[PDB]
Design a protein around this ligand. Structure first.
Ligand SMILES: *[C@@H]1O[C@H](CO[C@@H]2O[C@@H](C)[C@@H](O)[C@@H](O)[C@@H]2O)[C@@H](O)[C@H](O)[C@H]1NC(C)=O
Ligand code: NAG
Ligand code: NAG
Ligand code: NAG
Lengths: 287, 16
């Protein structure tokens, strides 16, 4: 599917369908202050093509939304390139949310989770966040129904972490996926076979970098690669783009080339050589 | 923090 840009959806769900063909959201996704919505508005609303968000996902005051299992069933990675304070996932004052249900979420590459003040929210104690975030120390998961819920799981890969039992499930009908330790963050197939080391979270076939659901490093021409090879540039810290792409952006921020990256603007101490979008340093003061 | 809380409070001083 498409790569869509960061979005900020308020008041109406009309603009939410702009996401219908996205595989990747290159930016953040904020859905907020939806006071007109009811559960019926979300019974037939799904974005099954969405696999990854490069920055953060934020949900605040969205009426009638009871679970995210139908909205984002296949969301596998939130990269956290840019964060909301220090958070890659924010669920705040979500009036009717009964469960997260992000049963395909395998990795949050950078940043923490803040799930606060969700009066109906359950299925939180059942999630092993250590499988998703390296550091759960900065998680702030407080003031939810689950602070007594009666969370009931399908069968799940239950575990004891410290002295705490954690059943590892997202909903009454969805377990949390777990891979052998040898797979690290790469993911595995249903049979436990490791995805390629260039994959992140999941793959359709083992040990094949063209069969990844998402990439650990960079994406190029249906393949996960360690770094962008020439003549390509690193873009948004997840994909390889060509000069012409960076140039088209500039002529539509006015994007520049710097250290094999296509970026919004020249850093301090540099000026942009006009004929080739290239940041050049300033000998003496910058013009 | 209270800073996160305060960000939201302050946003609700927008027009809809
Ligand atoms: C430069 O890039 C343009 C944009 O498309 C990108 O490249 C193709 C091959 C796909 O990988 C697509 O997902 C990318 O967004 C192309 O229109 C153009 O043909 C490319 N030219 C060269 C020489 O690579
Ligand atoms: C999504 O894809 C469908 C089918 O290809 C197309 O009709 C529709 O206009 C597209 N919408 C967006 C917002 O990309
Ligand atoms: C998330 O992925 C990153 C990069 O692939 C990795 O460093 C980190 O260990 C992953 N987190 C978990 C808990 O798998
Ligand atoms: C992983 O990917 C495969 C193939 O794309 C799919 O069958 C599966 O539902 C995905 N998620 C999990 C939890 O394995």
């Amino acid at each position: 599917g498409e790569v869509c840009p960061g979005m900020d959806i308020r008041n109406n769900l009309t603009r939410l369908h702009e996401l219908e063909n996205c595989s990747v959201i290159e930016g953040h996704l904020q859905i907020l202050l939806m006071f007109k919505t009811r559960p019926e508005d979300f019974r037939d609303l799904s974005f099954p093509k969405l696999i990854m968000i490069t920055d953060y996902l934020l949900l605040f005051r969205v009426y009638g939304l009871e679970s995210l299992k139908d909205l984002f069933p296949n969301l596998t990675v939130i990269r956290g390139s840019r964060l909301f304070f220090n958070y890659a996932l924010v669920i705040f004052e979500m009036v009717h949310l009964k469960e997260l249900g992000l049963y395909n979420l395998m990795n949050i590459t950078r940043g923490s989770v803040r799930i606060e003040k969700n009066n109906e929210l359950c299925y939180l104690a059942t999630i092993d966040w250590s499988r998703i975030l390296d550091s759960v120390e900065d998680n702030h998961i407080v003031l939810n129904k689950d602070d007594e819920c009666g969370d009931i799981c399908p069968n799940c890969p239950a575990t004891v972490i410290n002295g705490q039992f954690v059943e590892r499930c997202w909903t009454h009908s969805h377990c949390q996926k777990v891979c052998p330790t040898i797979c690290k963050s790469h993911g595995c197939t249903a049979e436990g076979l490791c995805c390629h080391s260039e994959c992140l979270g999941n793959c359709s076939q083992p040990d094949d970098p063209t069969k990844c659901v998402a990439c650990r490093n960079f994406y190029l021409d249906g393949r996960c690669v360690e770094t962008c090879p020439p003549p390509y540039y690193h873009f948004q810290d997840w994909r390889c783009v060509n000069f012409s792409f960076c140039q088209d952006l500039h002529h539509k921020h006015q994007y520049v080339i710097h250290n094999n990256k296509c970026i919004p603007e020249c850093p301090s101490g540099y000026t942009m050589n006009s004929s080739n979008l290239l940041c050049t340093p300033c000998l003496g003061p910058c013009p | 923090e209270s800073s996160f809380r305060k960000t939201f409070e302050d946003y609700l001083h927008n027009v809809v």
